Structure 1
């Protein structure tokens, strides 16, 4: 490996942890392409997240980010976020970007362009409706799914359908993003960031922050269960997506995070601890199960097991209880 590429994998290992391992196991040209895609998205996200950068200054950075991939000198030395190194050493990342085959570059640049436009759109609004929730998640995560799928198809290890079915790829990304948003309520609230959709939470409390108050715990958990139920509606598309993958390393790369997100939602379901910090995800149980689960029947079995755990815990009086049973029964019969 070149020194710059070595550096990129160091950055991947430092700034991911969640994806670092599955990425390094990808076959042939997919490995570098996905590594660089990850690092580029990490840089863009680090700009978006940085609340020390004013809106006026941030908007052009997000819009023009895709063009910086082609500016060999471009770096950003003003970030105060924890992943700032990817911005300060951006030339190393963009150089390895320009070392990828054109067919990968085109995908990565296009997704970066579209993500930047979408992230900037949300700088001046919170998330209101459930449709707006889906739109924000599309911009920050569904497009990652679509990008990854287009990389898989461009590599020719997967069929054109994987890249073409943007709805299924979008659902894959939405499922991860919604799960993270649900899980991270308190951390986000403490850092002054709000991602739960107002049209949902405002039916329970007057301010999203009010879910951190102990007197509102019952309402908080109702809202939590409603949002979890919404996220579960992506699982049918996740199953469809995973069922089409031919390459073992691509299958593992795609399946592992989805299962971890399912285990997370199961741990969060009807759980007061969401509102007091990190909940005990039985993530060890999921990691252990996924070691062996390298095919669709094994992954389905795991999905059902976690759905069954949620199902038998649905409180009779929970306002979403009928909906939660309904989506679980649908998933079971996919």
Structure 2
């Protein structure tokens, strides 16, 4: 590997990785660079020290910067700011990619940037808006990855073309994350839980942090969880199609981790008191297990059974939670 490509894998290892590195053939570098490029865009987007005036063109034009050898950004106050400051090193390697991979990455960057710039302006209102936001920031990652798999010809064209299944992969992950991250987000001035949902419980999203609202908080939590569970049938469909082993593991691992994190957050008061995280050894076993459909399906079913037997009769979402788990299982 060249010096510039080695520096890219160094950033990958620091910002996320062996899963990406286990990818077969040309997929490995294409996904490494796709990661770093979208983490750079997100690093701009997350930076609350960048005025909306500055941020907008940065988001809209990011896809062009990939083609500008000397472009970097020196004003970030985020942790990962290295990928922006050394961006020329990443964009060099982007431009060293086969064109079929470059064009995938450029197109997704372009579309995510439009979508990100759209939401600087607003919080998520409806469940429809939550889906749109998640598509912009996560569904489009699924889409891009899927097209690399197909463009590299390690997977059937259908993987690259079925945008909804790929969308659903990114939505599951991103909703799981938003759900679990309630408090650290709240404490950082960020609101990502859809107002349409939380507003049926409390006057303000921040109210879920007060002890007196814990019952309502957990109810809302469970409703959102139940909402996230609707993506699982697509996740299963998506995973059932994958024929390359390294791609399978790449895709299955984050899904099984999200599944276990959701089950962990289900009906869990601790979501509103801190970060709920699966144990390291638990995570390691799931990663090692998630290597074929039968195994991934058993994992999904086991955690879904666990949620199912934990559903409170009085939870206002309890019949929906039961319906979706029933659908998944069958």
Give the TM interval when normalised to the shorter protein. over 0.9
Instruction: String of CA shifts for 1:74-127, please: whole Å, max 9, x gaps.
Output: 000000011100000000000000000000000000000000000000111110
1:4 aligns with 2:4: yes
Between 1:89-98 and 1:291-300, the stretch displaced more is: 291-300
Q: 1:152 aligns with which of 145, 149, 154?
A: 149
Contact kept? 1:168, 1:237, Cα under 8 Å:
yes
The list of structure 1 runs, each at least 4 consecutive aligned residues, that deviate by more than 6 angstroms after superposition, is: none
| CA-CA distance at 1:292 after TM superposition | 3.1
Superposed, 1:92-103 pairs within 5 Å as 92-103=89-100
Partner of 2:119: 122
Contact kept? 1:186, 1:275, Cα under 8 Å:
yes
Contact kept? 1:245, 1:251, Cα under 8 Å:
yes
- C-alpha change, 1:166 and 1:93, in structure 2 (3 Å) is same
Instruction: String of CA shifts for 1:256-294, please: whole Å, max 9, x gaps.
Output: 000000000000000000001112424532431331331
TM norm structure 1: 0.97
Alpha-carbon distance in 2 for matches of 1:194, 1:222: 18
Alpha-carbon distance in 1 for matches of 2:290, 2:77: 40
Contact kept? 2:257, 2:286, Cα under 8 Å:
no
Gaps of 5+ in 1: none
Instruction: String of CA shifts for 1:26-57, please: whole Å, max 9, x gaps.
Output: 00000000000000000000000000101111
Contact kept? 1:264, 1:283, Cα under 8 Å:
no
Instruction: String of CA shifts for 1:147-184, please: whole Å, max 9, x gaps.
Output: 00000000001000001100000000000000000010
- Number of residue pairs matched by the alignment: 329
Q: 2:237 aligns with which of 221, 237, 240?
A: 240
Alpha-carbon distance in 1 for matches of 2:194, 2:67: 36
**Secondary structure, counterpart of 1:227 in structure 2:** helix
Instruction: String of CA shifts for 1:203-236, please: whole Å, max 9, x gaps.
Output: 0001100100111000000000000000000000
Contact kept? 2:139, 2:167, Cα under 8 Å:
yes
**Secondary structure, counterpart of 2:192 in structure 1:** coil
TM norm structure 2: 0.99
Q: CA RMSD in A?
A: 0.8
Alpha-carbon distance in 2 for matches of 1:59, 1:289: 39
Contact kept? 1:268, 1:281, Cα under 8 Å:
no
Alpha-carbon distance in 2 for matches of 1:286, 1:123: 34
Contact kept? 1:130, 1:199, Cα under 8 Å:
yes
- C-alpha change, 1:123 and 1:321, in structure 2 (3 Å) is same
- C-alpha change, 1:151 and 1:284, in structure 2 (3 Å) is same
| CA-CA distance at 1:21 after TM superposition | 1.9
Between 1:133-142 and 1:292-301, the stretch displaced more is: 292-301
| CA-CA distance at 1:314 after TM superposition | 0.2
Alpha-carbon distance in 2 for matches of 1:143, 1:280: 25
**Secondary structure, counterpart of 2:259 in structure 1:** helix
